[PDB]
Amino acid sequence: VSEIRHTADRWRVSLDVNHFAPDELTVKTKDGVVEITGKHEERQDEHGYISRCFTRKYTLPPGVDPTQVSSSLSPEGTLTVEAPMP
């Protein structure tokens, strides 16, 4: 579900969020913390009504600037959050 994918001088994490829609996801960054929230209201699926929420927090290494944190969603529902090093 989660993958640590740091590169030489670039912080990088991956996360399986296939159950959520792009607008159901929130990526928030503050003081050495990246924060991912996935959330949708009760809605029908095949088996009935499901509502989901999750909050995922990653610690950001020192020196890393939260201005530089970015994200992207793969078609197959994998969210990536990266940041370069100083």
Partner: peptide
């Protein structure tokens, strides 16, 4: 999809 980040 190029999701934005809130600071």
């Amino acid at each position: 999809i190029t999701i934005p980040v809130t600071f």
